[PDB]
Design an enzyme around this catalytic site. Sequence first.
Site, PDB file in Angstrom:
ATOM      1  N   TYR A   1       0.864  -1.201   0.000  1.00 48.34           N
ATOM      2  CA  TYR A   1       0.000   0.000   0.000  1.00 48.34           C
ATOM      3  C   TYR A   1       0.908   1.262   0.000  1.00 48.34           C
ATOM      4  CZ  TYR A   1      -4.473   2.500   0.610  1.00 48.34           C
ATOM      5  OH  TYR A   1      -5.564   3.316   0.402  1.00 48.34           O
TER       6      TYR A   1
ATOM      7  N   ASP B   1       5.069 -12.795  -7.218  1.00 42.36           N
ATOM      8  CA  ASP B   1       4.211 -12.111  -6.289  1.00 42.36           C
ATOM      9  C   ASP B   1       2.739 -12.513  -6.537  1.00 42.36           C
ATOM     10  OD1 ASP B   1       3.012 -10.242  -4.541  1.00 42.36           O
ATOM     11  OD2 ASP B   1       4.586  -8.780  -4.941  1.00 42.36           O
TER      12      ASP B   1
HETATM   13  C1  LIG Z   1      -2.133  -4.009  -1.111  1.00 44.54           C
HETATM   14  C2  LIG Z   1      -2.108  -3.891   0.332  1.00 44.54           C
HETATM   15  C3  LIG Z   1      -2.118  -3.703   1.516  1.00 44.54           C
HETATM   16  C4  LIG Z   1      -2.239  -3.283   2.887  1.00 44.54           C
HETATM   17  N1  LIG Z   1      -1.592  -4.095   3.897  1.00 44.54           N
HETATM   18  C5  LIG Z   1      -2.188  -4.982   4.827  1.00 44.54           C
HETATM   19  N2  LIG Z   1      -3.377  -5.616   4.631  1.00 44.54           N
HETATM   20  C6  LIG Z   1      -3.927  -6.332   5.802  1.00 44.54           C
HETATM   21  C7  LIG Z   1      -3.237  -7.700   5.951  1.00 44.54           C
HETATM   22  C8  LIG Z   1      -3.562  -8.482   4.670  1.00 44.54           C
HETATM   23  C9  LIG Z   1      -3.011  -7.766   3.432  1.00 44.54           C
HETATM   24  N3  LIG Z   1      -3.549  -8.497   2.312  1.00 44.54           N
HETATM   25  C10 LIG Z   1      -3.498  -6.315   3.300  1.00 44.54           C
HETATM   26  N4  LIG Z   1      -1.474  -5.103   5.879  1.00 44.54           N
HETATM   27  C11 LIG Z   1      -0.409  -4.381   5.636  1.00 44.54           C
HETATM   28  C12 LIG Z   1      -0.407  -3.723   4.410  1.00 44.54           C
HETATM   29  C13 LIG Z   1       0.682  -2.870   3.926  1.00 44.54           C
HETATM   30  O1  LIG Z   1       0.764  -2.244   2.859  1.00 44.54           O
HETATM   31  N5  LIG Z   1       1.736  -2.811   4.913  1.00 44.54           N
HETATM   32  C14 LIG Z   1       2.849  -1.966   4.543  1.00 44.54           C
HETATM   33  C15 LIG Z   1       4.074  -2.778   4.235  1.00 44.54           C
HETATM   34  C16 LIG Z   1       3.975  -3.955   3.450  1.00 44.54           C
HETATM   35  C17 LIG Z   1       5.120  -4.695   3.134  1.00 44.54           C
HETATM   36  C18 LIG Z   1       6.341  -4.245   3.617  1.00 44.54           C
HETATM   37  C19 LIG Z   1       6.487  -3.091   4.356  1.00 44.54           C
HETATM   38  C20 LIG Z   1       5.349  -2.354   4.692  1.00 44.54           C
HETATM   39  C21 LIG Z   1       5.468  -1.149   5.472  1.00 44.54           C
HETATM   40  N6  LIG Z   1       5.561  -0.182   6.098  1.00 44.54           N
HETATM   41  C22 LIG Z   1       1.718  -3.437   6.172  1.00 44.54           C
HETATM   42  N7  LIG Z   1       2.659  -3.398   7.200  1.00 44.54           N
HETATM   43  C23 LIG Z   1       2.162  -4.200   8.292  1.00 44.54           C
HETATM   44  C24 LIG Z   1       0.827  -4.743   7.832  1.00 44.54           C
HETATM   45  N8  LIG Z   1       0.669  -4.193   6.533  1.00 44.54           N
END
Ligand SMILES: CC#CCn1c(N2CCC[C@@H](N)C2)nc2c1c(=O)n(Cc1ccccc1C#N)c1nccn21
Lengths: 728, 728
Positions: B593, B670
């Site tokens: 995101y 991915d």
């Molecule tokens: C597309 C999308 C998304 C949104 N997402 C989610 N969601 C809920 C769980 C299930 C998933 N399917 C979608 N959790 C998310 C995210 C998301 O972007 N990051 C940032 C992120 C992702 C990967 C690496 C670093 C960072 C950082 N900083 C993150 N950090 C902790 C939890 N999360």
Amino acid sequence: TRKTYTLTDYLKNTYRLKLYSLRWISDHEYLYKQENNILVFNAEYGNSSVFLENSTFDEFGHSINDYSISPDGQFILLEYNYVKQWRHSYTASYDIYDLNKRQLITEERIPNNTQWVTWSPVGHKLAYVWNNDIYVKIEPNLPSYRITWTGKEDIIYNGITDWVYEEEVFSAYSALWWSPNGTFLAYAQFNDTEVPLIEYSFYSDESLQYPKTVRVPYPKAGAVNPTVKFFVVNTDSLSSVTNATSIQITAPASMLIGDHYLCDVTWATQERISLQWLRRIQNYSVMDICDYDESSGRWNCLVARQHIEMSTTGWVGRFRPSEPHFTLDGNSFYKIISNEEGYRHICYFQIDKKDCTFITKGTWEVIGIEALTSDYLYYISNEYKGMPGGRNLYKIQLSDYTKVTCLSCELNPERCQYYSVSFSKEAKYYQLRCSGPGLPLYTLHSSVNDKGLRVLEDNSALDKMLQNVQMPSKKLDFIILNETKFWYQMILPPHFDKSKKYPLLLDVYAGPCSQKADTVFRLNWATYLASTENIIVASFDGRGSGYQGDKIMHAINRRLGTFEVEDQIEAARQFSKMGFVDNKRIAIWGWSYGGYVTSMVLGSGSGVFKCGIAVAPVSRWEYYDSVYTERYMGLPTPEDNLDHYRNSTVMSRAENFKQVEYLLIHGTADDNVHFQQSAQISKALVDVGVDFQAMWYTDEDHGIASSTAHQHIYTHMSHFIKQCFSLP
Amino acid sequence: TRKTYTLTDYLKNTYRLKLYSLRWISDHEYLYKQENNILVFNAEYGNSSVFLENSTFDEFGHSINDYSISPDGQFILLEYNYVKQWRHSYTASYDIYDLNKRQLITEERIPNNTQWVTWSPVGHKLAYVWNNDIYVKIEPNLPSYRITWTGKEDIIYNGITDWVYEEEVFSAYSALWWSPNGTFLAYAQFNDTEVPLIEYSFYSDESLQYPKTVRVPYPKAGAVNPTVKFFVVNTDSLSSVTNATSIQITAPASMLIGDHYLCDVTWATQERISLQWLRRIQNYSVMDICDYDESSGRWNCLVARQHIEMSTTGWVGRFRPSEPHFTLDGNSFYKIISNEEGYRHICYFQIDKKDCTFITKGTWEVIGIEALTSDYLYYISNEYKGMPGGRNLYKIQLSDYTKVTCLSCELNPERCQYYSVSFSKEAKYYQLRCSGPGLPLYTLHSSVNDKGLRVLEDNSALDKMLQNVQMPSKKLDFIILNETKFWYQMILPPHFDKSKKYPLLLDVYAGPCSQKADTVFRLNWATYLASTENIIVASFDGRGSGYQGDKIMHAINRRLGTFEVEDQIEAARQFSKMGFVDNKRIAIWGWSYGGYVTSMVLGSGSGVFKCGIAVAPVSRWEYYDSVYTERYMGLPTPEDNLDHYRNSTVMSRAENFKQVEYLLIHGTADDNVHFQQSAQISKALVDVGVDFQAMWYTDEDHGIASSTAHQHIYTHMSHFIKQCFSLP
Ligand SMILES: CC#CCn1c(N2CCC[C@@H](N)C2)nc2c1c(=O)n(Cc1ccccc1C#N)c1nccn21
Ligand SMILES: CC#CCn1c(N2CCC[C@@H](N)C2)nc2c1c(=O)n(Cc1ccccc1C#N)c1nccn21
Ligand SMILES: *[C@@H]1O[C@H](CO)[C@@H](O[C@@H]2O[C@H](CO)[C@@H](O)[C@H](O)[C@H]2NC(C)=O)[C@H](O)[C@H]1NC(C)=O
Ligand SMILES: *[C@@H]1O[C@H](CO)[C@@H](O[C@@H]2O[C@H](CO)[C@@H](O)[C@H](O)[C@H]2NC(C)=O)[C@H](O)[C@H]1NC(C)=O
Ligand SMILES: *[C@@H]1O[C@H](CO)[C@@H](O[C@@H]2O[C@H](CO)[C@@H](O)[C@H](O)[C@H]2NC(C)=O)[C@H](O)[C@H]1NC(C)=O
Ligand SMILES: *[C@@H]1O[C@H](CO)[C@@H](O[C@@H]2O[C@H](CO)[C@@H](O)[C@H](O)[C@H]2NC(C)=O)[C@H](O)[C@H]1NC(C)=O
Ligand SMILES: *[C@@H]1O[C@H](CO)[C@@H](O[C@@H]2O[C@H](CO)[C@@H](O)[C@H](O)[C@H]2NC(C)=O)[C@H](O)[C@H]1NC(C)=O
Ligand SMILES: *[C@@H]1O[C@H](CO)[C@@H](O[C@@H]2O[C@H](CO)[C@@H](O)[C@H](O)[C@H]2NC(C)=O)[C@H](O)[C@H]1NC(C)=O
Ligand SMILES: *[C@@H]1O[C@H](CO)[C@@H](O[C@@H]2O[C@H](CO)[C@@H](O)[C@H](O)[C@H]2NC(C)=O)[C@H](O)[C@H]1NC(C)=O
Ligand SMILES: *[C@@H]1O[C@H](CO)[C@@H](O)[C@H](O)[C@H]1NC(C)=O
Ligand SMILES: *[C@@H]1O[C@H](CO)[C@@H](O)[C@H](O)[C@H]1NC(C)=O
Ligand SMILES: *[C@@H]1O[C@H](CO)[C@@H](O)[C@H](O)[C@H]1NC(C)=O
Ligand SMILES: *[C@@H]1O[C@H](CO)[C@@H](O)[C@H](O)[C@H]1NC(C)=O
Ligand SMILES: *[C@@H]1O[C@H](CO)[C@@H](O)[C@H](O)[C@H]1NC(C)=O
Ligand code: NA
């Protein structure tokens, strides 16, 4: 002060090379598309008439891609709805316009999504391929005769080639061969039943929610290859009531023992056809001469008339056995074959005799046979001034072989040293096409006394435009390695000073039968690099390069990724030691085979090169197609050449990339050199902790030729070469 | 001079954070792994014993990935042959070791390629999923009983989730729930028949000649979703009946009207299960409470026990409706729900009354319910000092709600502001896990008196190491935007000088319910950048962020790529106003995101940022899965929210990318955010003539977590940031 040739000049085609593409229609006239109109030219006098007006199809309702006037001049095949497939394959929609009754044909139209179409060589019959099957049309307004019923997408191909035969065998999608007068239609049938499928994602427009998977039957080295059958149908004895009858010509027993290919089809006479078959081990080939038996209605290929062509040092032919050139009676022929000293020359054959007679000799080669009459054979060769990178038109007197006349050598020696030719139907006239060292020159001549009738196009306009541009020059010369001379070329910056150190970019192909040192005049990326960035752009032809004999060409036999790689390094090592080259600023770049060579050079641990760019490179020979790979490498089995396939990879050299800067480029929809090849290079460098530059091109293929992508690739590479050479 | 925290220190893990991972086996004992030996600890006295010696499985012939002891401690499930799939899913081989007999079980083995395995919560019964079917073992050496026969690869999933249910609904592979005493086994069945497939290439080792195509049922936004069914089987009947009946519990009529989801399964008692269903339009959820009818063998859900949870401002729950916490008798439950002010607090319900009583309140929220005893409920919240970035443990008296003790607040207030907890089987003891702002601290406490028994791990070893290192600092504060407090954090370089101008890196997530401004101590890439490269690494929680009320969290409802994007631009402007930021050196970077927000920010034309890195970004909402995307955006139909889906793509902003240096990175395998998304960004930049930097990571997924690719990615990113900021 005058301007340089910039990147935008190359990218926008500011400076256009004018051409003169003509289409012979008889022994006396040609067609030329001038101001969107088709004109008819009398070769003898130069006078013209309007054959077809540009306004004729203003109310057509479709953008016409191409046209094909029938041999009789009565009909025009109108091509539109063009959808590109591979290098030569495409589908399109066709309409026939009656030139005499000034009206389009609306009865029994050629179907949409037509795979291939061709007029008979004489008259106005049509052979076409749709949904993998062959159809024949005796007249344009009449119903089609269905020749084959076996046609199946991605499996059974009739009258069209599969992926491998199109790319590596016929350099064409068509697998149709009409008889001289159009009585018979010969075709090949391909079977890809057990050929594995190359699969890749296709993203398409932003609007496509889920990516599409493209699946192509593609035989990688050692995989199951397509199978081939050969058939002949009589288009004169076709019936509406009854299904067409195709006579099969089977391959010789020497080929049927194992895997083989159909590699050449050439009609000899109205009732005699030659075929060349090549074994999967491409060092053995067989030519069959087949005659039509009027009584039985069969095609008999006499054993006495078989011709074996083989090689003990390498493969057969430059890329495949050569095309025979039959006499009017088809009882004898001329064919370029490799002589006892390994040089390619014209041999004369009788159809029923094993021994052939070489009509040419020397430490040079014949490029092609261009025209044949009862008195003379016309050919192109690199004999003049002992330059393997030059090309000239010659005529050999068939009654006295000692009487060889060069026809182009002395025309304009300073401007013109590289020629191609185009003859009229019975060789009464010829168009000479000069492509370098000077600007392209197009001329019309007559064979009787080799008179220079007129100048068709001299590019004087471009000359006038280039007068105000600081243009680079080109040095063609040689270096001596192990008593052998090998040629190189250098694109030198304007106002070149032999007392200054210039950075150097080595432009590599280095594949089997390659030639990167020639007299051709080019306006490309290397022009801008020398003109604006003052970079010397060099290319070298070492072992494995062509047009110089088999001793050089066959040096890389069963050993790709060795000598041709070593030789490029030795060439750069030598250039570095020249006073005018900055040894701390030496770079290497290549596309396709050149990208493989660039990557093997960067991972050689030589220390000669600072940086390099690989575009759509081959990385492991087991990833490339059977026909090409196996011609040079043989089969990748332990009994054959598995050890060399295994140690000739880019991947194994990943560690050596630590002391160079690398830029790796590839298009995602490359059906030729699969993205897989680059994905494996990246993974290997990542695995050994090597940092590099990368760029994929979404939905681009081997050419990366879409206008936007082409502009994007050269912009990105220019920034890289510039950063590497500390240039603003 | 002291050394700095370098890129190598981060990539090579030179400064290691010590953990204290214990596994509660009862109310007063836990397991701990010390020097490959598994020790059993008495929580009351801290005295141990070797439960299982490191030598025990020396001659096993396999490396044991993990172990799981049966609830009664009679058997140990040994997991080996671990083959990862998605985020939680994997395949593995399993052996059972008899702890009593000190022998390995060689008969009626758990099959190879087992999808999931679990012990009953009491005893030694086993439930497992093999080939999409559920099997049960009453005894480890005795034959399994087959539960389902519908199991079909990529079609029917029994007891295991599909891609979307694993990722977005259950955050687990598992879709089986044993009743408290193990009599019944409850399960979900997923039907992916009409669900479209995501297809991508998998290159695998260099030895693989043809790339493999990975095909996964994956519903993109607005596509066909998997259908779900729920069942319950009496495992105690298996040995008396030939084929025990799986009784279905159907969704309520308010769910059956359209597409819905099963979002929660919670057993209340031995004969009572609660199910939560959520409509595809995630703003309406329903809880059914179902009781076993002993005479019919059926499960009945009374309408009197049905509870509705809805939202007028957004979706239900933070990511899904919350889990209920039942009292022993199962006649009442505690659930986190959004109050009238939009803040998440604990509500108390009677199973047959529709109106609940809130037991907590205030301008702060309850993160989770941790344990429920006959007199107390224990929960984590962010109430302390009004910091939404903090986490503490609280205790509420069930007989008097005015009686709330913070069990963790003041233990070590300078060192500890963020807590999680692990209670014993009947909450007799608790491990407190402190993660910041100081070094992580693990302590063991007793619930009878809330007295600290001992420090389990203090990280004195790391503190000793960190003393010879110039460590950066972390500032946590807020800014007042439109009368609202919006929180931010900064990783400041050592010897931070308020009079100096520093390059800034804005580290982004900004998804709905995100929090990037917290009190957790981290040793990451930002540590290196601030410590060695003297960069300020900032993060900001704007509109759409979580744990601060629904007013902030639902501000982006049906409008992703708007306020959360704009607030990040605002954040950087506000930082510039602080006077210690070089306005010429502002960068932005994010993953998933964060990758999307970075890309949207970079294409806004704001002029604020010089450069930015996007790792595995979302580019167009129609490419992302249904469950996540639709929760916030609704449907991509013209009757719902198509116009916003088409307006919130990265591609529509490709022209403004001319103003910035962009680095695009994505893994090819991915399965979460498809490569398709970066393949569509690049294509759009190429089309409008924009130069950028790209990087693909072969066979890497959303995590780019392989040891090699991890180091490769951070190295490449560092070079790019350093170049952008002109750091040598
Ligand atoms: C597309 C999308 C998304 C949104 N997402 C989610 N969601 C809920 C769980 C299930 C998933 N399917 C979608 N959790 C998310 C995210 C998301 O972007 N990051 C940032 C992120 C992702 C990967 C690496 C670093 C960072 C950082 N900083 C993150 N950090 C902790 C939890 N999360
Ligand atoms: C992979 C491979 C290869 C070998 N190849 C062939 N073959 C025969 C025809 C069919 C094909 N499949 C195999 N023709 C080839 C090549 C090849 O690499 N280059 C360099 C090349 C390719 C692309 C762009 C620039 C350059 C330059 N300079 C080239 N230039 C002119 C002809 N060719
Ligand atoms: C080739 O394609 C066109 C379009 O499908 C066909 O032309 C007609 O086009 C209209 C719409 O433009 C359609 O309603 C019809 O299906 C078409 N039919 C006729 C009889 O004209 C066309 O017929 C196709 N040509 C061939 C030779 O199959
Ligand atoms: C092209 O060649 C064919 C074959 O040589 C000619 O067909 C033959 O013509 C004679 C008539 O004089 C017949 O007796 C044969 O039986 C025919 N052979 C076949 C195979 O059909 C034909 O004349 C030629 N067509 C043109 C247009 O010149
Ligand atoms: C075609 O090339 C091959 C390979 O170089 C030659 O085949 C031989 O046969 C087997 C293959 O299993 C090997 O044991 C031999 O050593 C190969 N012979 C050699 C290397 O001389 C074969 O010589 C070639 N055919 C012709 C007609 O030259
Ligand atoms: C922790 O210490 C206690 C006290 O020694 C151990 O408790 C048990 O107490 C009996 C008394 O009759 C002793 O005979 C045993 O040594 C103990 N039983 C067992 C089953 O171990 C207890 O052992 C200790 N805990 C651990 C994990 O060693
Ligand atoms: C999973 O759902 C599919 C439909 O999406 C079901 O397959 C249908 O089954 C009925 C018989 O019950 C057939 O008449 C149809 O031919 C099928 N439709 C499709 C689209 O395949 C399937 O039965 C469901 N399976 C389970 C085990 O619940
Ligand atoms: C056990 O019971 C199940 C459920 O009643 C059986 O399932 C049916 O199998 C038949 C075909 O053999 C089908 O016509 C139905 O669609 C199935 N229903 C379900 C819910 O799966 C199952 O085959 C039985 N197993 C044994 C060993 O008898
Ligand atoms: C666990 O709970 C189940 C469900 O209540 C118990 O099974 C019931 O046992 C009672 C005896 O107290 C009987 O009246 C019923 O026949 C049972 N119902 C079902 C559905 O089995 C079970 O015995 C309990 N097991 C243990 C080991 O405590
Ligand atoms: C050219 O000129 C000749 C007269 O010499 C004329 O009869 C002939 O048909 C002309 N050809 C064209 C193509 O105009
Ligand atoms: C194609 O080859 C397959 C075996 O590879 C064979 O069974 C099939 O009959 C072939 N089809 C034709 C039309 O020759
Ligand atoms: C010719 O061949 C096909 C397929 O083998 C058949 O179905 C068709 O009806 C045939 N036509 C005649 C006229 O015999
Ligand atoms: C698992 O696989 C191995 C080798 O393929 C085999 O020896 C063994 O019998 C298998 N075990 C089970 C429990 O199926
Ligand atoms: C659910 O969302 C849609 C879309 O905004 C809306 O029309 C509907 O009334 C909402 N339902 C509730 C219960 O708020
Ligand atoms: Na003349």
